[PDB]
């Protein structure tokens, strides 16, 4: 009735690092070798067929379909023995003796007059039948799920598995044996309705019948093995060529345990055992040491890593985990149910997750969050989910078909989605809230041959015999080709424009070399143990890394020599960060709770304090200066984490959402309301502000704006079949011509009158090299070095820009500090400028020389790094001006200057501007932007199309060639997405870094480092089809196409 | 040739778009089903009456390894060594036929 | 049908509409050196320093052999079983005597 014995969060990771070492179990000096590497193939169906092999070296079965050690899921066996009764052998090779009936080991048995049925924790059940000629042994006959889906097995004479048949009584697989080893499988074949055949895998055996070689349908060897006299494996070789060699030894227990492992790359490991005390030691060539201590049950109780971190565990009968204890004393505790189902977990902070299950099956009925909010589920008598209920009370409904496949979803507000499924378990037709279907088409092998959208456009795919993708193709005719090698360790991607990108790997599968279209070679270097050491750039400059015993990043060196050194606590968390300049240091210190979450940051600039909710969602923040004033922020979320209120020194921001999660409306500090009427996502979306209609959108069957109303005038859009914007018109005009790579190469502005046209030229890698205008009034040419450092024209057509330090370009000159930060800039338009930086690498003070002398501008930053105020002082500290900002989640919303207020309204959730509102009350005036494809504005129109402000730009940095305004006084500063012009210095702000439009580069390296790319000063390959609004949610520390810690 | 006269009877042919013979008829009947590699894998002889069908199985290299008839009155299986030397069935499923000298096959 | 080539990789591949791949590998002179069928059957060639074929090795392992004269004219050919053919050439690069020797009368 239970206790069926056998013989073999942060806590869930510590436990998994000690149970197994190197595939080598810790307590048992054995092997376990099962993963996707041994997953020979997989077939579609209501019940998938997964051919997963397993090797243990501890099972006692000397014979089988694949030899000693190896096992297959369909070799399950049941034996009946005298009481000193019933025994079950699983896929993993664990001998389970039940006896004469739920068990805590996740196994259920019940015997019927004619057969026996075993159900696991989930709905999968397996049915045995008596073995012909033997009443003391049983063999697998049927498999099934909670639904009616099932698999049958048909055996041959001599009791050898022959066929596997599906629920519809149709054969799928067939086994073929040999003559030398009739008990060993040789080939596996697949059957189609056409009575055809196709081989999937082949096996070759040694002189002892032990599996030695595996081959695919294409005859390419994938895996090799070798064996000792006792059938114990000593060598296994993967597909990439990597060879692992083992050794075995005999102990006083008359059981064989592994003692030594090595490879062809120099990696080595040595194991030592002391069974009296249950102690296991592991040693490496690097002199690293690991220690484990286990109990008589062969369960781990003590773990000691290379760093002397100590973990302890407590075990209960039936092999359940009760408690885990960390080096700091923090205790994780668990509590189960009578059936073994987990009920509660509690962590050192005392925040508990709880769940209440059912009785018929192991299904969760209620879930509880640490805050107390609960999720409710109610099921169908067959186990299928029928409805879900959230804390807010909003319900969701599902309908399940006969075979347990969902066919209709009803969400809140009555929105309905419907689906049709294939007999093999493959989706065919999907419908949205409206009648807009997307359909699929499948090939004989069961892959996605084609996809059909609402408009009827077809996309086609051509696969290999093994399913590996080769080509993708569109209706317009463009195609993409992929080149791969099973063992060649080479891959290639061919752009629709014909250009190829190559990748080369190593024996471990790690990327080693990349080659671009123009031969730019990027290389990587690895240690014997697989740890990255050097990353070598296109030009030759290399970044370097150095790792500690625990494989935690210790030191990072950039191109210029600037180094970062990290210090880790006893629980694998950083507490000290040191930045050393290239040939004084900067130190940041941290203080964190028992869990990983951060409380305090200390810098020479001051102190920062944080406060979270039990769900690890930030609720309060503070910064206190060094003997100075203090500022603070507060937040307030909803039951689902939705942010409802944000309170700061500026005031209060209030949001209200819909049941679908959309942002229905918002309230400003000035108490005005923004309302947005969603239909989930579709037509007749509207923006109303406080009662004044601003813009109403009419959308197409893909939910793309085809018409936009901007007052008394309307704007229309026309898109291509492939989905690219082709033309735009404005009548109460413009055309874009692209390339095969979707780059923008031509832009016509007039068709009804003398056409004005513009051109751009790109390299194969997207870098823009030239620019011309149809008026012939402009001409620009750009030259780039490898690694994308701009060059000063043909004067320096060839030459290395060291460390990506741009020193001169035309009349500009730059100077750089030891940390890579610009300090001095020299030009003619605005003279010489100097900059000063905070400890967090932020810009505070800019000094400029003017006819009035040395003017100054100082920037004020909030706790999170956002910009709130800017102040300009003339000489002798005489204030000239001040401007203040109001954000809305990393997106500018309002700005305020002397008796002036400006509100920005965007389109959708992007940074792209749509409308600008000036003044309050009767003084409110509404104006509309006319943006380009990149969001860069070109004219600002009142109603009736009056161009109040017009601009023309260069390609880079939207540097102004001409601007014109009449009586309108407010300045336009938006420029690119995320940017705001600072006329007092001429450098854009973005959100976290300043941008120099003269050279198209940032003035300081990326705070996050290599995550942003190899070049730390780069904005993008081209500013016409790329964006980088952040220049880098909430950032506790510190690109897109058209380790740092966060919340 | 779409039509051929053979005396008092006429014969008609129907070809696929790709150019492969698909069916043939003879009235004053037969159908071929191919594979993606254009190999012949099925041959039906009757459509107006009880259909009689035949099958063939090929390797990836085109070598024919099996043959079956819809009447179930015939069954043949062929095993080849590397270099395409016929083998005497499973009795010699593996082994080198030296110099392509075939010495025995069934009673020969 | 898909074709795979390398500008300097000296590897080529043809993918049948049925999905199966045939591979060819060349040498520094561009001469074919190895062929691999869909099922791994490997056919190999051997060349002399001067680019003259010497051996043609079959799928199983049996090899045909060749021997050339000063003028790069075929002199001797050996089959798998040892049967040899020897050619005699006149003063104007034309054959006048053909001798077939059985494996161990002509």
Numbering used by the authors:
A (entry chain A): 268 to 275, 289 to 302, 305 to 366, 371 to 386, 395 to 877, 891 to 1039, 1051 to 1350, 1408 to 1413, ...
B (entry chain B): 1012 to 1039, 1051 to 1130
C (entry chain B): 774 to 877, 891 to 892
Authors' own words:
T6SSs mediate bacterial antagonism by facilitating the injection of toxic effector proteins into competing bacterial cells in a contact-dependent manner. The rhsA operon contains genes encoding its cognate VgrG spike and Eag chaperone proteins, both of which are required for the delivery of this effector into susceptible competitors.
We previously demonstrated that a fragment of RhsA lacking its N-terminal prePAAR motif and TMD (residues 74–1486), RhsAΔTMD, is stable in the absence of its EagR1 chaperone and can be purified to homogeneity as a soluble protein when over-expressed in Escherichia coli. The raw images and 2D class averages suggest that RhsAΔTMD forms a stable dimer in solution, which facilitated structure determination due to the increased size of the particles. The high quality of the map allowed us to build an atomic model of 75% of the protein, comprising residues 268–275, 289–302, 305–366, 371–386, 395–871, 891–1039 and 1051–1350. In line with functioning to self-cleave the C-terminal toxin domain, we observed that the density of the cryo-EM map stops abruptly after tryptophan 1350. The density filling the cocoon is, for the most part, not well defined and is apparent only at a much lower density threshold compared to the rest of the map, Nevertheless, we could build three β-strands of this domain, comprising residues 1408–1413, 1420–1423 and 1458–1461, respectively, all of which interact with the inner surface of the cocoon structure. Interestingly, the density inside the Rhs cocoon not only ends after tryptophan 1350 but also before proline 305, suggesting that RhsA is proteolytically cleaved at this position as well. Our structural data show that the C-terminal aspartyl protease domain of RhsA seals the cocoon-shaped structure at one end, while the other end is capped by an N-terminal domain that adopts a smaller structure. This N-terminal domain of the barrel, formed by residues 268–386, caps the cocoon structure in a manner that is reminiscent of how a cork is used to plug a champagne bottle and thus we refer to it as the N-terminal plug domain (RhsAplug).
